[PDB]
Amino acid sequence: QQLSSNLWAAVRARGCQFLGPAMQEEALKLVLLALEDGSALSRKVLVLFVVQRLEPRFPQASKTSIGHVVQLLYRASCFKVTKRDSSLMQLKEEFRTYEALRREHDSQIVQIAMEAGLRIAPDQWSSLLYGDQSHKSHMQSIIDKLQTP
């Protein structure tokens, strides 16, 4: 798809990455593993935690690519950041379950598509983000919220 290619180019243009439906899911679940309980990790340590556990099952995982995944979450305003002179990152309380964090994640990607002027329907979103046709109403719901006049 040209559509997919333009979307991911748009995502990369903003310092972010989507690693693919299977890999991104596991990445996000590992972010949760580290931050569920409100632990406060630097970006370095968060990336390290996730790459460490992701790479065994998805060997192409890197500090660079997972940094770009975390940046996507940062851009989605998922973190409470405590600055210091090296900042520490906490998952906002409202996003400490997978479905909630994943929803904010997807929504940020839909915002990016909107910025990039890319018109994408829910069945396409379901393919792009989940690699199935079982997430249409999830994506449609995200779209509805972003399309308030």
Numbering used by the authors: 177 to 261, 264 to 327
Please quote the authors directly.
The protein Roquin (encoded by Rc3h1), known to bind target mRNAs and promote their decay, has been found to be crucial in the maintenance of peripheral immune tolerance. Roquin is a ubiquitously expressed RING-E3 ubiquitin ligase family member containing a highly conserved ROQ domain required for RNA binding and localization to stress granules and a CCCH zinc finger motif. Roquin binds a stem-loop structure termed the constitutive decay element (CDE) within the 3′-UTR of Tnf mRNA and recruits the Ccr4-Caf1-Not deadenylation machinery leading to mRNA decay. mRNA degradation can also be mediated by Roquin’s recruitment of Rck/Edc4/Dcp1a decapping complexes and is thought to occur independently of miRNA activity. Our work identifies a role of the immune modulator Roquin in regulating mammalian miRNA homeostasis by promoting mature miR-146a degradation.
To gain insight into the molecular details of the interaction of Roquin with RNA, we determined the crystal structures of the ROQ domain (residues 177–326, to 2.2 Å) and a larger construct containing the RING, ROQ and zinc-finger domains (residues 1–484, to 2.75 Å) that incorporated the ‘san’ mutation M199R. There were two copies of the ROQ domain in the asymmetric unit of the first structure, with a dimer interface of 759 Å2. In Roquin, the 150-residue ROQ domain is inserted between helices 2 and 3 of the HEPN domain (beige) and is mostly α-helical. The domain boundaries differed slightly from those suggested by earlier sequence analyses. It has seven α-helices interrupted by a short β-strand between helices 2 and 3 and a β-hairpin between helices 4 and 5 (α1-α2-β1-α3-α4-α2-α3-α5-α6-α7). There are no other examples of the overall fold of the ROQ domain in the Protein Data Bank, and therefore this can be considered a new protein fold. The ROQ domain can be subdivided into an N-terminal winged helix–turn–helix (α2 to β3), followed by a C-terminal helix–turn–helix (lacking the ‘wing’ of the first, α5 to α7). These were preceded by an extra helix (α1) that appears to stabilize the relative orientation of the two sub-domains. A comparison of our Roquin1–484 structure with that of the wild-type ROQ domain demonstrated that the M199R mutation induces only a minor conformational perturbation but one that is likely to interfere with binding to either an RNA or a protein ligand. Although M199 and R199 occupied a similar spatial position, the presence of the mutation (located at the N terminus of α2) resulted in distortion of the C terminus of nearby α3 and the loop that follows it. In particular, E231 and R233 are shifted significantly and F234 flips out from its position between α2 and α3 to become completely solvent exposed.
